[PDB]
mmCIF file of C-alpha atoms in Angstrom:
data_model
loop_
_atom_site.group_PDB
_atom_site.id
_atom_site.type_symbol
_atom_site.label_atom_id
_atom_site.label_comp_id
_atom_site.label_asym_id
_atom_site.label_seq_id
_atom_site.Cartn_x
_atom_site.Cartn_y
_atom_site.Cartn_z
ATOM 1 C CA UNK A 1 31.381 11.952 -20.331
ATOM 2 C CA UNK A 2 32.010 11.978 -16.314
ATOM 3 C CA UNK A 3 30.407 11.059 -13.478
ATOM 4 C CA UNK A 4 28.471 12.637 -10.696
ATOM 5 C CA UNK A 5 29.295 13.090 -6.910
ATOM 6 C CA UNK A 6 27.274 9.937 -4.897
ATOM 7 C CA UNK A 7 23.223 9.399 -6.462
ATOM 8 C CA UNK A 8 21.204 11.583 -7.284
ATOM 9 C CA UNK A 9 17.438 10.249 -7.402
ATOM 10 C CA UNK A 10 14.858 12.684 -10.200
ATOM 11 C CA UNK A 11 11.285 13.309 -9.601
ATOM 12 C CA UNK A 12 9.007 15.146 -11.638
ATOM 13 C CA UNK A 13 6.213 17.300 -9.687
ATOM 14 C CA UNK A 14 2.935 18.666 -12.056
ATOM 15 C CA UNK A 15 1.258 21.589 -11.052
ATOM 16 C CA UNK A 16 -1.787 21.036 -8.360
ATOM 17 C CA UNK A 17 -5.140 21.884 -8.743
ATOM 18 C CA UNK A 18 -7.399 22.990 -6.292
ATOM 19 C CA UNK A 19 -10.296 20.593 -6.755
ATOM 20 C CA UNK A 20 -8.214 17.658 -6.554
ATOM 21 C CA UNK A 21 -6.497 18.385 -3.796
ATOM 22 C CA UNK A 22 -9.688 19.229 -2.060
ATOM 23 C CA UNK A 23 -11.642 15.827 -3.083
ATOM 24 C CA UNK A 24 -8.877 13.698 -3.380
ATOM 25 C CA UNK A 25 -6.614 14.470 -0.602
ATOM 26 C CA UNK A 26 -9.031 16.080 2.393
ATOM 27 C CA UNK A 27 -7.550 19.600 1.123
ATOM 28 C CA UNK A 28 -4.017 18.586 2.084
ATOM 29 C CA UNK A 29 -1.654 19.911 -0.320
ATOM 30 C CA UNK A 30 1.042 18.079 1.376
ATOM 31 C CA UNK A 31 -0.398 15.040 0.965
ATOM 32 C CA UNK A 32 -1.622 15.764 -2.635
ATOM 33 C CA UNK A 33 2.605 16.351 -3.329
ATOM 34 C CA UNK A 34 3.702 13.110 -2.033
ATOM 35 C CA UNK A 35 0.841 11.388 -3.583
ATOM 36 C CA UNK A 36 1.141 13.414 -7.343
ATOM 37 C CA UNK A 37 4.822 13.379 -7.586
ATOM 38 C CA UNK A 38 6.151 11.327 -10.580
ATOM 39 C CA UNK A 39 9.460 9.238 -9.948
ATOM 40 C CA UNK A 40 12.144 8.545 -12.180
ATOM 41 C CA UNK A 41 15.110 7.035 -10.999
ATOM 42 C CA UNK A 42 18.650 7.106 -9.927
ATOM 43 C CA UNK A 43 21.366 9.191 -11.761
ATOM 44 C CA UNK A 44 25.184 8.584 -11.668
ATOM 45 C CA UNK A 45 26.561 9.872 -14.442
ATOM 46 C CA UNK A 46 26.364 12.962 -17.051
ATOM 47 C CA UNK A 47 25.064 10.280 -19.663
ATOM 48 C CA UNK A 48 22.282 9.535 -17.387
ATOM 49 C CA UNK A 49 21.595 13.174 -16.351
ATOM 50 C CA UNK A 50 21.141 14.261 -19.990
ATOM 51 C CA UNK A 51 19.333 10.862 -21.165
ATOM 52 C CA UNK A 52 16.732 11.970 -18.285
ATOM 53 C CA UNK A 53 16.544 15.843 -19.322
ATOM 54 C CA UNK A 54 15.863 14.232 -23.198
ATOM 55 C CA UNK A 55 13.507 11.953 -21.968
ATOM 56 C CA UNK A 56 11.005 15.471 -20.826
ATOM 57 C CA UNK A 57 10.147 18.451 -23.314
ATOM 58 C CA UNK A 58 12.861 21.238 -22.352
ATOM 59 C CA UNK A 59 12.240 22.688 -18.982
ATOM 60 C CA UNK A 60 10.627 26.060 -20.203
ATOM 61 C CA UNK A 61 8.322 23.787 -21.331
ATOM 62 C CA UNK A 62 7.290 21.326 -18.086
ATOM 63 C CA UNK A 63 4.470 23.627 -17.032
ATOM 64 C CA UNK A 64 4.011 26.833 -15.074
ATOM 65 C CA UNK A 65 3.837 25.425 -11.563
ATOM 66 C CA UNK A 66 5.523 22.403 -12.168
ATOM 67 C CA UNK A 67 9.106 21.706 -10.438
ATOM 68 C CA UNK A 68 11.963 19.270 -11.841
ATOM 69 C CA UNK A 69 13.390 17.942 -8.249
ATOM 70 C CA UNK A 70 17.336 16.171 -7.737
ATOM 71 C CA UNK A 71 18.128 15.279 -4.558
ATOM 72 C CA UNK A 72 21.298 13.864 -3.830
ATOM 73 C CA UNK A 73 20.614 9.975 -1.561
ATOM 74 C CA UNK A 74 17.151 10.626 -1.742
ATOM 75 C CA UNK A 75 13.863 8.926 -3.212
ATOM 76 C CA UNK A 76 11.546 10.763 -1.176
ATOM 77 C CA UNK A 77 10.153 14.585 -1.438
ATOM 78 C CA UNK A 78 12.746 16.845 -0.247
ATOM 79 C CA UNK A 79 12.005 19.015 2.737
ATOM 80 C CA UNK A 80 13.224 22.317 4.033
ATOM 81 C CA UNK A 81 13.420 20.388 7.595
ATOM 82 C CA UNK A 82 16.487 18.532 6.139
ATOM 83 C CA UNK A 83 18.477 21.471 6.709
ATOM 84 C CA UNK A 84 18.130 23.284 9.891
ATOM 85 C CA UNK A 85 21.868 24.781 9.501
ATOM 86 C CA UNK A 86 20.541 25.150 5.462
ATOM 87 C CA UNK A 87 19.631 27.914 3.158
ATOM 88 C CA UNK A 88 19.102 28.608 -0.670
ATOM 89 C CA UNK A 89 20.222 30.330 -3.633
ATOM 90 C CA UNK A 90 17.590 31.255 -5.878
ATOM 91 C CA UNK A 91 18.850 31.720 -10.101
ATOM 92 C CA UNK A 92 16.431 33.187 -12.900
ATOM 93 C CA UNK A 93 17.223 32.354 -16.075
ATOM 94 C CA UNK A 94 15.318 34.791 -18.552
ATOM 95 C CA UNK A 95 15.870 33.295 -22.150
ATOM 96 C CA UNK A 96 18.617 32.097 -24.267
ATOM 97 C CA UNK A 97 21.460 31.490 -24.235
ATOM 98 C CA UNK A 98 21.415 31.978 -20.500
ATOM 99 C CA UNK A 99 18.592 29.576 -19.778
ATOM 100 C CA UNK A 100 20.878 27.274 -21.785
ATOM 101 C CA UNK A 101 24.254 27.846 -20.837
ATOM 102 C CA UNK A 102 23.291 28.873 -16.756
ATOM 103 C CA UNK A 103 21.255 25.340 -16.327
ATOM 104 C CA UNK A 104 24.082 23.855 -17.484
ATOM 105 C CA UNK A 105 26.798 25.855 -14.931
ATOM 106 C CA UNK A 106 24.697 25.404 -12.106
ATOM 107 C CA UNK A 107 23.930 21.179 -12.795
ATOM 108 C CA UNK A 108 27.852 20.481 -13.286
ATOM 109 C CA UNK A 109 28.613 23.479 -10.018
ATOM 110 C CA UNK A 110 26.085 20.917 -7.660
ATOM 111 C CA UNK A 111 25.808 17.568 -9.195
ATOM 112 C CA UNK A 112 29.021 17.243 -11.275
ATOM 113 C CA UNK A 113 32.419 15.418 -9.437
ATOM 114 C CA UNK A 114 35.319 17.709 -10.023
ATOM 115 C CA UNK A 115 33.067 20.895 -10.470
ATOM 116 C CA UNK A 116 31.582 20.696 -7.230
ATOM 117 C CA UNK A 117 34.606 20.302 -5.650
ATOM 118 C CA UNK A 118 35.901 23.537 -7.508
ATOM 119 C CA UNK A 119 32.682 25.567 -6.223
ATOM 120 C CA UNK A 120 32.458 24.233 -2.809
ATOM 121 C CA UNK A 121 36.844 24.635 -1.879
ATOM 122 C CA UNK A 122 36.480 20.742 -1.611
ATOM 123 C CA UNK A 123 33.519 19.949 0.102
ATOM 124 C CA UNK A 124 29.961 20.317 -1.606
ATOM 125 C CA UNK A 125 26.975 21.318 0.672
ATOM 126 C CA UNK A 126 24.382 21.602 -2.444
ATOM 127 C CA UNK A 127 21.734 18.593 -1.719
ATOM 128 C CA UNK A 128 18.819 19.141 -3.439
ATOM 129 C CA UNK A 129 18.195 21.203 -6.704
ATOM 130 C CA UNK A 130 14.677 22.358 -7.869
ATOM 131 C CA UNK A 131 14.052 23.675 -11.461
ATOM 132 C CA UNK A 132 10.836 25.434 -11.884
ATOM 133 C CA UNK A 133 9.078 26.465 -15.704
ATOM 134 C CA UNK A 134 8.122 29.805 -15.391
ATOM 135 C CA UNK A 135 7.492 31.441 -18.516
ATOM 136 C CA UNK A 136 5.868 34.670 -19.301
ATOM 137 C CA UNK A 137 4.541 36.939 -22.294
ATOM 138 C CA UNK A 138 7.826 38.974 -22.342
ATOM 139 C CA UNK A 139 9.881 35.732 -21.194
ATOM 140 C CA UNK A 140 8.322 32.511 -23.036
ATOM 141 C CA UNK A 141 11.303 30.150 -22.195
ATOM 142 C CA UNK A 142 12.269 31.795 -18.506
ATOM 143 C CA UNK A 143 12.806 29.027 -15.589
ATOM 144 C CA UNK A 144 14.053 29.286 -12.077
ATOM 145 C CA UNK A 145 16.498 26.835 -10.614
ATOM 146 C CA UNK A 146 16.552 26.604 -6.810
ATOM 147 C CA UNK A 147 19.455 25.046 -4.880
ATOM 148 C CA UNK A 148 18.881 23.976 -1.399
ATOM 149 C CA UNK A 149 22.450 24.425 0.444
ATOM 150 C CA UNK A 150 22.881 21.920 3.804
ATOM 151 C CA UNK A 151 25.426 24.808 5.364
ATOM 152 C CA UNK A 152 23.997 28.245 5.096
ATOM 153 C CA UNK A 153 27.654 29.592 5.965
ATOM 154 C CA UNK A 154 29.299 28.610 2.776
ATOM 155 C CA UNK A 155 26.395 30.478 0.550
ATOM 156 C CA UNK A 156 28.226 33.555 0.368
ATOM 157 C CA UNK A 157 30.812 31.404 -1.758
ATOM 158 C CA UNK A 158 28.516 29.208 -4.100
ATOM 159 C CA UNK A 159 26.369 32.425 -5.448
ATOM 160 C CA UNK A 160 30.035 34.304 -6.118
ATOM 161 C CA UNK A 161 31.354 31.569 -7.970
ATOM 162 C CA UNK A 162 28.298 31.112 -9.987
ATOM 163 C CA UNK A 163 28.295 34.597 -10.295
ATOM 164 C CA UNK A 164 31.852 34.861 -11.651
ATOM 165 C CA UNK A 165 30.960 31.821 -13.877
ATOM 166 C CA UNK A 166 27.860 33.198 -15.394
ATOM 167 C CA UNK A 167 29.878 36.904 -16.593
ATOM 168 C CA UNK A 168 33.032 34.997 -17.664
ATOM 169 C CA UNK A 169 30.192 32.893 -20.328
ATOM 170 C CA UNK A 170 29.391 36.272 -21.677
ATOM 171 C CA UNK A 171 26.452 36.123 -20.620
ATOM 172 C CA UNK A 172 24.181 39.352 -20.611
ATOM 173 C CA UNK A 173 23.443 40.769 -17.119
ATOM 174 C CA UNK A 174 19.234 41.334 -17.981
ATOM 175 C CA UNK A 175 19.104 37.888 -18.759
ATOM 176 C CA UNK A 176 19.268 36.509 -15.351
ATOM 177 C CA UNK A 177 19.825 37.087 -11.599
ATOM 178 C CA UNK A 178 21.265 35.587 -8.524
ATOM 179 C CA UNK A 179 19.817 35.660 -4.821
ATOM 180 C CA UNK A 180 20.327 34.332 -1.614
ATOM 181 C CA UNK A 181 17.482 33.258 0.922
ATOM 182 C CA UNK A 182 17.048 31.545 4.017
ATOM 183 C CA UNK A 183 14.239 28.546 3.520
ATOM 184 C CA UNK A 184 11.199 30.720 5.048
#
């Protein structure tokens, strides 16, 4: 029951076929995103953020190739371009509680008011956030949640507070893992 730092606008990206892409969009694949993605809308609030996550099966369950896409002022497709001072943090989440509990960390650490401000030393530089379904034989409800940082210099900080955050939950440390990458 709190609100979120400025708008965030949600889009919801399926998985892309080959054949469409090919017949439908001149085999453009960039063209085929823009033209498959599936908006939602604005989010200012927690209320809203969980309304829209209720709205969609749980995100284990969106589809292998799909990708769950916030970006903060934004209605349009996200691009790495955005950023050229940028770079990301990449988090697997294996299965529960961690898928669970970690989503949740990471959503209030980039989207929330006061716990971005607690992450960031009072200035947030997370602007987009990507959540992927990737599940597996072994790992049935693992996902990957990718945050897109505008300042690459304050990474180093964001993945070791979520890292601190994630062992003071309890949380098991083969249930998930934390990396840093530049956009390439």
């Amino acid at each position: 029951t709190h609100a979120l730092r400025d708008k965030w606008f949600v889009s919801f990206l399926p998985l892309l076929t080959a054949d469409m892409v090919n017949t439908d969009y001149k085999g453009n694949w960039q063209l085929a995103a823009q033209e498959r993605t599936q908006k939602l809308d604005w989010i200012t609030s927690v209320e809203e953020l969980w309304s829209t996550m209720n709205s969609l099966p749980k995100v284990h369950q969106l589809g292998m190739g799909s990708t769950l896409i916030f970006a903060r002022n934004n209605k349009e497709p996200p691009s790495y371009e955005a950023y050229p001072n940028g770079s990301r943090i990449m988090i697997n989440l294996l299965k529960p509680p961690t898928t669970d509990a970690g989503l949740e960390l990471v959503l209030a650490v980039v989207m929330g008011e006061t716990a971005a401000e607690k992450a960031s030393d009072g200035k947030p530089v997370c602007d987009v956030l990507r959540i992927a379904a990737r599940p597996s034989r072994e790992h049935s409800e693992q996902i990957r949640v990718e945050v897109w940082l505008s300042d690459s210099t304050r990474s180093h900080a964001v993945a070791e507070f979520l890292a601190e955050a994630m062992r003071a939950k309890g949380l098991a440390a083969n249930s998930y893992n934390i990396a840093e990458a530049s956009f390439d």
